[PDB]
XYZ file of N, CA and C in Angstrom:
855
model
N 3.792 7.802 -28.977
C 3.856 6.687 -28.049
C 4.003 7.089 -26.590
N 2.871 7.337 -25.937
C 2.817 7.763 -24.545
C 1.998 6.776 -23.721
N 2.017 6.978 -22.403
C 1.196 6.213 -21.472
C 0.625 7.171 -20.437
N -0.579 6.865 -19.966
C -1.267 7.674 -18.969
C -1.242 6.952 -17.630
N -0.662 7.595 -16.620
C -0.753 7.109 -15.251
C -1.954 7.738 -14.562
N -2.478 7.043 -13.554
C -3.649 7.511 -12.822
C -3.440 7.251 -11.338
N -3.515 8.304 -10.532
C -3.180 8.237 -9.108
C -4.397 8.747 -8.343
N -5.343 7.865 -8.042
C -6.625 8.277 -7.516
C -6.747 8.103 -6.021
N -7.757 8.756 -5.446
C -7.937 8.701 -4.012
C -9.345 8.877 -3.480
N -10.334 8.289 -4.147
C -11.714 8.333 -3.672
C -12.424 7.118 -4.243
N -13.075 6.333 -3.386
C -13.781 5.135 -3.836
C -14.520 4.475 -2.680
N -15.744 4.004 -2.927
C -16.615 3.504 -1.866
C -16.742 4.551 -0.766
N -15.747 4.611 0.119
C -15.652 5.675 1.101
C -14.208 6.020 1.393
N -13.383 4.979 1.479
C -11.984 5.131 1.850
C -11.171 5.707 0.698
N -10.240 6.599 1.030
C -9.229 7.006 0.069
C -8.483 5.779 -0.432
N -7.888 5.892 -1.614
C -7.140 4.773 -2.171
C -5.728 5.216 -2.522
N -4.808 4.249 -2.531
C -3.400 4.490 -2.828
C -2.918 3.679 -4.021
N -3.817 2.990 -4.709
C -3.445 2.217 -5.879
C -3.200 3.137 -7.064
N -2.189 2.802 -7.861
C -1.829 3.572 -9.044
C -1.973 2.676 -10.267
N -2.449 3.262 -11.362
C -2.811 2.545 -12.574
C -2.115 3.154 -13.780
N -1.778 2.304 -14.740
C -1.127 2.734 -15.966
C -1.908 2.201 -17.155
N -2.099 3.048 -18.163
C -2.710 2.635 -19.419
C -1.690 2.820 -20.530
N -1.375 1.737 -21.231
C -0.579 1.826 -22.447
C -1.438 1.457 -23.647
N -1.535 2.326 -24.658
C -2.428 2.038 -25.788
C -1.919 0.925 -26.672
N -0.636 0.585 -26.561
C -0.004 -0.485 -27.321
C -0.802 -1.781 -27.214
N -0.847 -2.366 -26.018
C -1.717 -3.508 -25.779
C -3.170 -3.095 -25.587
N -3.412 -1.826 -25.254
C -4.712 -1.336 -24.796
C -5.183 -2.118 -23.567
N -4.424 -1.965 -22.485
C -4.739 -2.585 -21.209
C -4.569 -1.551 -20.105
N -5.301 -1.745 -19.013
C -5.192 -0.899 -17.831
C -4.552 -1.696 -16.700
N -3.266 -1.995 -16.850
C -2.576 -2.795 -15.850
C -1.999 -1.901 -14.763
N -1.932 -2.448 -13.556
C -1.541 -1.693 -12.382
C -0.029 -1.575 -12.272
N 0.391 -0.688 -11.376
C 1.785 -0.560 -10.976
C 1.823 -0.427 -9.462
N 3.014 -0.181 -8.917
C 3.186 -0.130 -7.472
C 2.305 0.951 -6.866
N 1.489 0.564 -5.890
C 0.631 1.530 -5.226
C 1.462 2.522 -4.417
N 0.831 3.642 -4.082
C 1.523 4.707 -3.376
C 1.726 4.327 -1.920
N 2.879 4.710 -1.369
C 3.206 4.314 -0.006
C 2.224 4.866 1.019
N 1.370 5.817 0.639
C 0.292 6.266 1.510
C -0.871 6.767 0.664
N -2.089 6.414 1.085
C -3.301 6.845 0.398
C -3.326 8.354 0.237
N -3.754 8.811 -0.936
C -3.897 10.237 -1.192
C -5.249 10.513 -1.831
N -6.045 11.321 -1.143
C -7.416 11.651 -1.505
C -7.432 13.055 -2.095
N -7.807 13.170 -3.365
C -7.746 14.463 -4.020
C -6.313 14.874 -4.288
N -5.624 14.059 -5.076
C -4.207 14.263 -5.324
C -4.021 15.343 -6.381
N -2.837 15.945 -6.374
C -2.322 16.666 -7.520
C -1.107 15.923 -8.050
N -1.091 15.692 -9.363
C 0.051 15.060 -10.010
C 0.315 15.725 -11.352
N 1.588 15.709 -11.751
C 2.070 16.206 -13.037
C 3.505 15.734 -13.226
N 3.821 15.142 -14.378
C 5.150 14.575 -14.569
C 6.175 15.689 -14.738
N 7.352 15.491 -14.150
C 8.459 16.439 -14.226
C 9.694 15.693 -14.700
N 10.258 16.139 -15.830
C 11.189 15.357 -16.645
C 11.051 13.849 -16.420
N 9.872 13.316 -16.767
C 9.606 11.879 -16.870
C 9.618 11.168 -15.517
N 9.282 11.876 -14.442
C 9.041 11.264 -13.139
C 7.685 11.734 -12.635
N 6.801 10.792 -12.321
C 5.481 11.145 -11.811
C 5.600 11.698 -10.401
N 5.099 12.909 -10.184
C 5.092 13.518 -8.861
C 3.674 13.510 -8.310
N 3.534 13.129 -7.042
C 2.240 13.086 -6.368
C 2.294 14.020 -5.170
N 1.626 15.161 -5.281
C 1.598 16.155 -4.216
C 0.467 15.811 -3.259
N 0.758 15.879 -1.961
C -0.082 15.330 -0.913
C -1.566 15.633 -0.919
N -2.301 14.859 -0.131
C -3.732 15.039 0.025
C -4.214 14.228 1.206
N -5.528 14.252 1.412
C -6.143 13.486 2.492
C -5.818 11.998 2.350
N -5.583 11.318 3.476
C -5.408 9.868 3.449
C -6.585 9.147 4.086
N -7.723 9.820 4.193
C -8.831 9.346 4.981
C -8.985 10.038 6.317
N -7.967 10.768 6.784
C -8.102 11.421 8.080
C -7.113 12.555 8.365
N -6.074 12.745 7.543
C -4.964 13.597 7.963
C -4.593 14.741 7.021
N -5.294 14.924 5.904
C -4.990 15.998 4.953
C -3.564 15.965 4.403
N -2.553 15.850 5.270
C -1.226 15.413 4.839
C -0.455 16.484 4.063
N 0.880 16.457 4.155
C 1.720 17.459 3.509
C 2.926 16.868 2.791
N 3.042 15.550 2.720
C 4.212 14.936 2.117
C 4.028 14.786 0.607
N 5.113 14.417 -0.067
C 5.130 14.303 -1.520
C 5.873 13.028 -1.895
N 5.389 12.346 -2.933
C 5.965 11.090 -3.387
C 6.161 11.148 -4.892
N 7.347 10.772 -5.357
C 7.600 10.647 -6.784
C 7.805 9.185 -7.162
N 7.680 8.918 -8.460
C 7.608 7.559 -8.982
C 8.403 7.477 -10.273
N 9.396 6.590 -10.309
C 10.199 6.401 -11.509
C 9.532 5.339 -12.373
N 8.945 5.698 -13.518
C 8.102 4.731 -14.238
C 8.881 3.585 -14.839
N 10.150 3.800 -15.182
C 10.927 2.742 -15.813
C 11.314 1.651 -14.819
N 11.534 1.999 -13.551
C 11.887 1.003 -12.547
C 10.706 0.544 -11.706
N 9.551 1.203 -11.821
C 8.408 0.954 -10.947
C 8.806 1.063 -9.481
N 8.983 2.286 -8.996
C 9.412 2.491 -7.623
C 8.873 3.822 -7.125
N 8.250 3.801 -5.955
C 7.798 5.012 -5.294
C 8.759 5.367 -4.172
N 9.112 6.648 -4.091
C 10.036 7.151 -3.081
C 9.394 8.327 -2.362
N 9.198 8.193 -1.047
C 8.725 9.299 -0.223
C 9.849 10.242 0.203
N 10.885 10.405 -0.625
C 12.065 11.193 -0.279
C 11.956 12.674 -0.631
N 10.926 13.089 -1.371
C 10.816 14.486 -1.768
C 10.421 15.347 -0.574
N 10.959 16.561 -0.540
C 10.754 17.442 0.599
C 9.271 17.764 0.765
N 8.776 17.848 1.999
C 7.345 18.114 2.218
C 6.911 19.498 1.753
N 5.652 19.848 2.009
C 5.132 21.168 1.691
C 5.156 22.061 2.927
N 4.891 23.350 2.699
C 4.843 24.305 3.801
C 3.717 23.963 4.767
N 2.504 23.812 4.247
C 1.349 23.435 5.044
C 0.658 22.240 4.401
N -0.079 21.497 5.224
C -0.801 20.323 4.752
C -2.074 20.741 4.029
N -2.215 20.307 2.778
C -3.333 20.722 1.947
C -3.728 19.579 1.024
N -4.999 19.564 0.629
C -5.513 18.549 -0.281
C -6.403 19.203 -1.327
N -6.825 18.393 -2.302
C -7.674 18.856 -3.400
C -7.010 20.009 -4.157
N -5.722 19.837 -4.443
C -4.879 20.866 -5.034
C -4.385 20.388 -6.388
N -4.439 21.266 -7.377
C -3.853 20.973 -8.665
C -2.375 21.313 -8.691
N -1.620 20.562 -9.489
C -0.211 20.862 -9.701
C 0.098 20.731 -11.185
N 1.113 21.465 -11.620
C 1.583 21.374 -12.990
C 3.077 21.641 -12.998
N 3.683 21.408 -14.153
C 5.121 21.539 -14.327
C 5.387 22.612 -15.368
N 6.446 23.388 -15.144
C 6.766 24.509 -16.016
C 8.180 25.015 -15.765
N 9.003 25.039 -16.809
C 10.371 25.503 -16.661
C 11.171 24.678 -15.680
N 10.960 23.362 -15.677
C 11.702 22.471 -14.809
C 11.424 22.622 -13.333
N 10.403 23.388 -12.957
C 10.027 23.593 -11.568
C 8.608 23.091 -11.344
N 8.357 22.558 -10.149
C 7.054 21.997 -9.804
C 6.249 23.034 -9.029
N 5.204 23.559 -9.663
C 4.269 24.463 -9.011
C 3.086 23.672 -8.466
N 2.686 23.999 -7.238
C 1.520 23.406 -6.589
C 0.615 24.545 -6.145
N -0.521 24.715 -6.821
C -1.389 25.863 -6.572
C -2.126 25.696 -5.251
N -3.178 26.481 -5.048
C -3.948 26.387 -3.826
C -4.807 25.141 -3.790
N -5.404 24.909 -2.624
C -6.312 23.793 -2.449
C -7.243 23.964 -1.267
N -7.413 22.892 -0.501
C -8.214 22.866 0.714
C -7.346 22.308 1.830
N -7.513 22.816 3.050
C -6.793 22.229 4.179
C -7.693 22.097 5.396
N -8.972 21.806 5.173
C -9.920 21.739 6.262
C -10.218 23.063 6.922
N -9.668 24.163 6.408
C -10.027 25.493 6.879
C -9.854 26.526 5.761
N -10.981 27.080 5.315
C -11.031 28.331 4.556
C -10.287 28.260 3.221
N -10.385 27.132 2.530
C -9.792 26.986 1.193
C -8.313 27.370 1.280
N -7.727 27.837 0.174
C -6.347 28.310 0.145
C -6.049 28.931 -1.208
N -5.296 30.033 -1.190
C -4.868 30.724 -2.402
C -3.355 30.711 -2.580
N -2.624 29.956 -1.765
C -1.167 30.028 -1.776
C -0.614 29.137 -2.878
N 0.541 29.525 -3.413
C 1.163 28.821 -4.529
C 2.650 28.700 -4.236
N 3.167 27.471 -4.206
C 4.576 27.254 -3.908
C 5.221 26.376 -4.969
N 6.486 26.676 -5.260
C 7.248 26.040 -6.323
C 8.033 24.856 -5.745
N 8.895 24.250 -6.561
C 9.759 23.164 -6.113
C 10.967 23.074 -7.025
N 12.158 23.116 -6.432
C 13.380 22.976 -7.205
C 13.811 21.520 -7.160
N 13.681 20.762 -8.252
C 14.079 19.348 -8.199
C 15.572 19.188 -8.056
N 16.333 20.173 -8.529
C 17.779 20.143 -8.422
C 18.248 20.409 -6.999
N 17.417 21.042 -6.165
C 17.821 21.407 -4.813
C 16.862 20.979 -3.710
N 15.668 20.476 -4.032
C 14.696 20.021 -3.034
C 14.274 21.125 -2.068
N 14.437 22.393 -2.451
C 14.118 23.481 -1.532
C 12.617 23.582 -1.294
N 11.826 23.566 -2.371
C 10.378 23.697 -2.271
C 10.034 25.049 -1.645
N 10.083 26.112 -2.451
C 9.897 27.490 -2.009
C 8.594 28.068 -2.545
N 8.045 29.051 -1.832
C 6.725 29.587 -2.154
C 6.836 30.862 -2.976
N 6.026 30.959 -4.034
C 5.963 32.161 -4.862
C 4.720 32.973 -4.511
N 4.209 33.733 -5.480
C 3.126 34.674 -5.216
C 1.805 33.953 -5.001
N 1.163 34.222 -3.863
C -0.177 33.707 -3.621
C -1.125 34.181 -4.720
N -2.275 33.527 -4.799
C -3.042 33.522 -6.037
C -4.032 34.676 -6.153
N -4.615 35.127 -5.036
C -5.795 35.997 -5.005
C -7.002 35.230 -5.520
N -8.116 35.312 -4.791
C -9.251 34.397 -4.917
C -8.809 32.977 -4.565
N -9.198 32.522 -3.376
C -8.863 31.181 -2.927
C -9.467 30.148 -3.871
N -8.736 29.060 -4.100
C -9.163 28.033 -5.048
C -8.863 26.649 -4.487
N -9.912 25.922 -4.116
C -9.830 24.500 -3.826
C -10.482 23.730 -4.962
N -9.991 22.518 -5.203
C -10.526 21.725 -6.296
C -10.334 22.366 -7.649
N -9.294 23.169 -7.796
C -8.958 23.780 -9.073
C -8.188 22.775 -9.911
N -8.395 22.819 -11.222
C -7.497 22.151 -12.148
C -6.641 23.199 -12.838
N -5.460 22.781 -13.274
C -4.496 23.690 -13.863
C -4.093 23.160 -15.230
N -3.378 24.006 -15.965
C -2.841 23.697 -17.283
C -1.829 24.784 -17.614
N -1.027 24.526 -18.642
C 0.055 25.425 -19.022
C 0.041 25.562 -20.538
N -0.086 26.794 -21.024
C -0.052 27.075 -22.452
C 0.811 28.301 -22.695
N 1.806 28.154 -23.562
C 2.723 29.243 -23.845
C 3.631 29.585 -22.684
N 4.226 28.574 -22.050
C 5.034 28.801 -20.864
C 4.316 29.588 -19.793
N 2.996 29.434 -19.691
C 2.183 30.328 -18.878
C 1.211 29.465 -18.081
N 1.301 29.513 -16.748
C 0.589 28.579 -15.873
C -0.803 29.100 -15.533
N -1.831 28.391 -15.996
C -3.208 28.835 -15.829
C -3.851 28.093 -14.664
N -4.630 28.819 -13.867
C -5.440 28.240 -12.801
C -6.906 28.426 -13.177
N -7.604 27.319 -13.413
C -8.929 27.332 -14.024
C -9.963 26.953 -12.972
N -10.883 27.876 -12.691
C -12.052 27.588 -11.879
C -11.727 27.239 -10.435
N -12.489 26.294 -9.899
C -12.345 25.867 -8.522
C -13.430 26.442 -7.637
N -13.224 26.286 -6.332
C -14.146 26.808 -5.331
C -13.394 27.674 -4.334
N -13.944 28.853 -4.037
C -13.450 29.659 -2.930
C -14.018 29.108 -1.630
N -14.044 29.925 -0.581
C -14.568 29.459 0.689
C -16.045 29.093 0.673
N -16.811 29.570 -0.323
C -18.268 29.470 -0.243
C -18.968 29.006 -1.519
N -18.471 29.296 -2.716
C -19.184 28.972 -3.943
C -18.196 28.573 -5.028
N -18.641 27.822 -6.034
C -17.731 27.451 -7.118
C -17.554 28.591 -8.104
N -16.377 28.624 -8.719
C -15.908 29.781 -9.465
C -15.990 29.539 -10.968
N -16.173 30.626 -11.722
C -15.984 30.602 -13.166
C -14.755 31.381 -13.612
N -14.076 32.068 -12.693
C -12.952 32.934 -13.009
C -11.681 32.123 -13.244
N -10.766 32.705 -14.017
C -9.519 32.057 -14.410
C -8.369 33.029 -14.187
N -7.302 32.558 -13.545
C -6.114 33.363 -13.291
C -4.896 32.677 -13.892
N -4.119 33.428 -14.664
C -2.922 32.926 -15.318
C -1.685 33.555 -14.684
N -0.560 32.839 -14.751
C 0.634 33.183 -13.984
C 1.865 33.240 -14.877
N 2.654 34.308 -14.729
C 3.919 34.456 -15.441
C 5.074 34.207 -14.485
N 5.808 33.099 -14.639
C 6.878 32.784 -13.676
C 7.941 33.855 -13.577
N 8.262 34.509 -14.692
C 9.389 35.431 -14.694
C 9.069 36.695 -13.907
N 7.848 37.218 -14.042
C 7.458 38.397 -13.278
C 6.818 38.056 -11.938
N 6.540 36.780 -11.673
C 6.013 36.312 -10.389
C 4.813 37.141 -9.932
N 3.735 37.057 -10.707
C 2.489 37.705 -10.325
C 1.360 37.101 -11.139
N 0.156 37.218 -10.601
C -1.025 36.621 -11.197
C -1.820 37.671 -11.958
N -2.422 37.243 -13.065
C -3.226 38.119 -13.911
C -4.523 37.401 -14.253
N -5.626 37.860 -13.671
C -6.930 37.312 -14.012
C -7.213 37.495 -15.499
N -7.815 36.475 -16.109
C -8.222 36.541 -17.508
C -9.674 36.097 -17.645
N -10.070 35.726 -18.860
C -11.474 35.564 -19.228
C -12.196 34.551 -18.344
N -13.280 34.936 -17.668
C -14.058 33.958 -16.901
C -14.645 32.884 -17.801
N -14.833 31.699 -17.226
C -15.458 30.610 -17.952
C -16.945 30.888 -18.151
N -17.595 30.001 -18.897
C -19.031 30.085 -19.053
C -19.768 29.782 -17.765
N -19.592 28.569 -17.245
C -20.290 28.110 -16.053
C -19.317 27.932 -14.893
N -19.848 28.041 -13.677
C -19.050 27.837 -12.474
C -18.715 26.356 -12.324
N -17.446 26.044 -12.054
C -16.978 24.657 -12.071
C -15.962 24.440 -10.958
N -16.286 23.563 -10.011
C -15.337 23.102 -9.006
C -15.065 21.620 -9.226
N -13.805 21.227 -9.049
C -13.350 19.866 -9.330
C -13.564 19.515 -10.803
N -12.940 20.298 -11.666
C -13.017 20.087 -13.099
C -11.723 19.425 -13.573
N -11.575 19.280 -14.882
C -10.362 18.716 -15.445
C -9.899 19.521 -16.638
N -8.577 19.614 -16.790
C -7.989 20.425 -17.847
C -6.770 19.756 -18.457
N -6.609 19.937 -19.764
C -5.325 19.735 -20.423
C -5.220 20.740 -21.565
N -4.239 20.537 -22.438
C -3.847 21.560 -23.398
C -3.968 21.051 -24.830
N -5.058 20.343 -25.121
C -5.283 19.801 -26.457
C -5.329 20.903 -27.506
N -4.726 20.630 -28.666
C -4.966 21.421 -29.873
C -4.618 22.895 -29.653
N -3.542 23.137 -28.899
C -3.043 24.486 -28.601
C -4.129 25.391 -28.026
N -5.128 24.792 -27.390
C -6.104 25.516 -26.593
C -6.251 24.793 -25.263
N -6.887 25.454 -24.308
C -7.078 24.891 -22.978
C -8.511 24.390 -22.883
N -8.670 23.076 -22.795
C -9.978 22.467 -22.629
C -10.220 22.218 -21.149
N -11.433 22.522 -20.697
C -11.869 22.224 -19.342
C -13.211 21.520 -19.424
N -13.331 20.378 -18.743
C -14.549 19.580 -18.773
C -14.978 19.230 -17.356
N -16.250 18.863 -17.240
C -16.828 18.323 -16.037
C -16.699 19.220 -14.817
N -17.013 18.617 -13.686
C -17.016 19.291 -12.410
C -18.406 19.343 -11.822
N -18.532 20.139 -10.768
C -19.789 20.364 -10.071
C -19.990 21.866 -9.948
N -21.141 22.363 -10.397
C -21.403 23.787 -10.223
C -22.039 24.030 -8.862
N -22.846 25.086 -8.761
C -23.468 25.439 -7.493
C -24.442 24.361 -7.022
N -24.927 23.517 -7.936
C -25.871 22.459 -7.599
C -25.302 21.067 -7.861
N -25.372 20.607 -9.113
C -25.160 19.207 -9.468
C -23.946 19.045 -10.381
N -23.347 17.847 -10.342
C -22.338 17.415 -11.303
C -22.800 17.732 -12.715
N -21.879 17.743 -13.671
C -22.220 18.242 -14.995
C -21.244 17.697 -16.026
N -21.655 17.773 -17.296
C -20.894 17.188 -18.391
C -20.477 18.187 -19.457
N -20.858 19.458 -19.342
C -20.483 20.422 -20.365
C -18.962 20.582 -20.408
N -18.480 21.209 -21.477
C -17.051 21.424 -21.658
C -16.812 22.764 -22.340
N -15.637 23.345 -22.092
C -15.283 24.639 -22.662
C -13.826 24.623 -23.095
N -13.526 25.404 -24.128
C -12.167 25.612 -24.607
C -11.840 27.096 -24.509
N -10.617 27.409 -24.101
C -10.159 28.788 -24.000
C -9.125 29.051 -25.082
N -9.349 30.093 -25.883
C -8.431 30.415 -26.965
C -7.342 31.331 -26.427
N -6.093 30.872 -26.323
C -5.042 31.727 -25.748
C -4.809 32.984 -26.542
N -5.215 33.004 -27.809
C -4.852 34.080 -28.712
C -5.987 35.069 -28.940
N -7.214 34.711 -28.568
C -8.315 35.657 -28.531
C -8.735 36.023 -27.114
N -8.260 35.289 -26.102
C -8.622 35.518 -24.700
C -10.132 35.431 -24.483
N -10.721 34.318 -24.908
C -12.151 34.128 -24.710
C -12.469 32.638 -24.709
N -13.363 32.242 -23.807
C -13.774 30.852 -23.691
C -14.857 30.529 -24.710
N -14.779 29.332 -25.280
C -15.740 28.885 -26.277
C -16.386 27.590 -25.805
N -17.706 27.548 -25.638
C -18.375 26.292 -25.277
C -17.973 25.142 -26.190
N -17.881 23.944 -25.608
C -17.515 22.729 -26.328
C -18.589 21.674 -26.083
N -18.707 20.734 -27.025
C -19.654 19.626 -26.934
C -19.480 18.918 -25.597
N -20.568 18.369 -25.062
C -20.570 17.815 -23.718
C -20.235 16.324 -23.730
N -19.924 15.803 -22.546
C -19.493 14.424 -22.382
C -20.699 13.482 -22.356
N -20.421 12.176 -22.276
C -21.499 11.190 -22.247
C -22.263 11.248 -20.931
N -21.552 11.203 -19.807
C -22.169 11.317 -18.494
C -21.530 12.461 -17.720
N -22.282 12.998 -16.759
C -21.722 13.984 -15.845
C -20.485 13.405 -15.178
N -19.461 14.233 -14.999
C -18.199 13.723 -14.456
C -17.563 14.817 -13.593
N -17.856 14.780 -12.294
C -17.248 15.706 -11.348
C -16.018 15.075 -10.714
N -15.076 15.924 -10.314
C -13.842 15.460 -9.712
C -13.051 14.553 -10.627
N -12.875 14.968 -11.878
C -12.222 14.145 -12.883
C -10.833 14.686 -13.176
N -10.113 13.948 -14.007
C -8.867 14.412 -14.564
C -8.983 14.405 -16.070
N -8.089 15.123 -16.740
C -8.080 15.157 -18.193
C -6.645 15.337 -18.649
N -6.229 14.513 -19.603
C -4.887 14.602 -20.149
C -4.924 14.145 -21.597
N -3.986 14.658 -22.385
C -3.859 14.294 -23.789
C -2.756 13.251 -23.907
N -3.105 12.087 -24.452
C -2.193 10.957 -24.581
C -1.925 10.728 -26.060
N -0.645 10.525 -26.398
C -0.093 10.437 -27.754
C -1.059 10.870 -28.856
N -1.712 12.016 -28.665
C -2.581 12.570 -29.683
C -3.994 12.897 -29.247
N -4.580 12.057 -28.400
C -6.013 12.076 -28.136
C -6.306 12.658 -26.758
N -7.336 13.498 -26.680
C -7.785 14.021 -25.396
C -8.738 13.036 -24.741
N -8.525 12.770 -23.453
C -9.464 11.942 -22.711
C -9.599 12.416 -21.271
N -10.818 12.317 -20.751
C -11.103 12.534 -19.344
C -11.246 11.186 -18.656
N -10.975 11.157 -17.350
C -10.954 9.906 -16.601
C -11.805 10.015 -15.341
N -12.393 8.881 -14.952
C -13.051 8.709 -13.667
C -14.089 9.746 -13.299
N -14.327 9.914 -12.004
C -15.178 10.969 -11.494
C -16.458 10.450 -10.860
N -17.394 11.379 -10.672
C -18.685 11.113 -10.058
C -19.777 11.678 -10.956
N -20.994 11.139 -10.820
C -22.108 11.638 -11.619
C -23.428 11.656 -10.854
N -23.390 11.736 -9.527
C -24.609 11.747 -8.747
C -25.193 10.387 -8.460
N -24.467 9.311 -8.765
C -24.903 7.964 -8.415
C -23.735 7.137 -7.885
N -22.741 6.863 -8.730
C -21.630 6.001 -8.349
C -20.310 6.585 -8.827
N -19.237 6.143 -8.174
C -17.884 6.460 -8.607
C -17.633 5.847 -9.980
N -17.005 6.613 -10.861
C -16.797 6.187 -12.236
C -15.412 5.579 -12.407
N -15.309 4.631 -13.337
C -14.021 4.082 -13.724
C -13.807 4.126 -15.226
N -14.735 4.705 -15.973
C -14.688 4.756 -17.423
C -14.050 6.059 -17.905
N -13.573 6.042 -19.148
C -12.967 7.216 -19.764
C -13.663 7.509 -21.085
N -13.648 8.777 -21.476
C -14.171 9.197 -22.765
C -13.079 9.949 -23.507
N -13.075 9.810 -24.831
C -12.073 10.424 -25.692
C -12.771 11.358 -26.669
N -12.206 12.553 -26.845
C -12.744 13.526 -27.790
C -12.289 13.192 -29.206
N -13.251 13.028 -30.114
C -12.953 12.979 -31.535
C -13.296 14.326 -32.140
N -12.311 15.143 -32.523
C -12.652 16.463 -33.070
C -13.305 16.384 -34.435
N -12.823 15.497 -35.309
C -13.391 15.410 -36.648
C -14.857 15.005 -36.610
N -15.264 14.252 -35.589
C -16.660 13.883 -35.399
C -17.365 14.742 -34.359
N -16.621 15.571 -33.626
C -17.154 16.480 -32.610
C -18.115 15.757 -31.662
N -17.572 14.764 -30.962
C -18.323 14.035 -29.949
C -17.334 13.314 -29.042
N -17.865 12.673 -28.005
C -17.083 11.866 -27.079
C -17.456 10.400 -27.231
N -16.454 9.531 -27.188
C -16.674 8.097 -27.298
C -16.213 7.419 -26.018
N -17.139 6.734 -25.353
C -16.810 5.976 -24.156
C -15.881 4.820 -24.507
N -14.788 4.684 -23.764
C -13.954 3.496 -23.869
C -14.106 2.646 -22.610
N -13.376 1.528 -22.587
C -13.567 0.547 -21.531
C -13.330 1.114 -20.146
N -12.276 1.900 -19.990
C -11.985 2.513 -18.716
C -11.075 1.666 -17.848
N -10.706 2.251 -16.712
C -9.706 1.703 -15.814
C -10.348 0.718 -14.836
N -9.524 0.105 -13.985
C -10.042 -0.900 -13.061
C -10.675 -0.238 -11.845
N -9.876 0.509 -11.091
C -10.386 1.217 -9.930
C -11.382 2.291 -10.342
N -12.421 2.458 -9.529
C -13.336 3.583 -9.678
C -12.728 4.779 -8.950
N -12.332 5.797 -9.707
C -11.542 6.909 -9.195
C -12.371 8.183 -9.193
N -12.483 8.808 -8.031
C -12.969 10.172 -7.929
C -11.813 11.053 -7.475
N -11.789 12.291 -7.976
C -10.754 13.250 -7.631
C -9.352 12.679 -7.671
N -9.003 12.029 -8.776
C -7.720 11.368 -8.863
C -6.856 11.880 -9.992
N -5.668 12.380 -9.658
C -4.795 12.976 -10.651
C -4.374 11.993 -11.733
N -3.849 12.561 -12.826
C -3.308 11.793 -13.940
C -1.968 12.380 -14.360
N -1.080 11.505 -14.837
C 0.161 11.931 -15.443
C 0.370 11.221 -16.767
N 1.199 11.829 -17.614
C 1.477 11.311 -18.950
C 2.987 11.289 -19.142
N 3.511 10.186 -19.686
C 4.946 10.024 -19.896
C 5.184 9.376 -21.257
N 6.288 9.760 -21.905
C 6.672 9.214 -23.203
C 7.782 8.185 -23.020
N 7.540 6.962 -23.493
C 8.522 5.881 -23.390
C 8.489 4.986 -24.627
């Protein structure tokens, strides 16, 4: 019994600050309190049951602030300590009770820096930079181990993957993906790391790949219904689904769910807002 939050920031042209919640109980996509400031290309990941939204473009300012959201009370608070530098199109994940925010874009030369966050102290301190700059990267965590999947450096989209050990504070490159993917989506379905969608060197795309943590090799996966660049992906009370994105025509608001026993994707109704590059969070209630 989980729910998926969606914190998007791309539509028509203007960034958006509306936040959406899906509960499978009623199977409805009803809204919640919008974010106190628009965030374009957000990073979000829940940290002990509080949705965290790490800054991004608001339509003009790239921005460095952070906002958390208490889902039980429906309240957004801009009280979390800011970041070192203003950056957008950055993935974030949670691990060992600390909030890691990987590299992104800041209107100059991508970024490879990675900074943590102590929720108990609000310090927000920086750990080991990443090597190979990554904007529009998606992240995931398998085996207490923080993975940075794909993205774009200063010039081209990447197929390389770098994993991080918090205790030794250093990065270790691992198996490159099949295809180059910037603005992809990742979660940790079925004790493997699935990555779907994105945009390669040319066009948006629908292929998908799974990484086996125990063989250290990526395995191609069945493709989605439509191309979906700048998407999110999260596993909700059992089922893997990707959300929103772009496909070379219009902003998407639909979601697809992976059925492993049938090895295909099934389009569902989807959310209200058409979301490009919009983070997702998952909470159990």
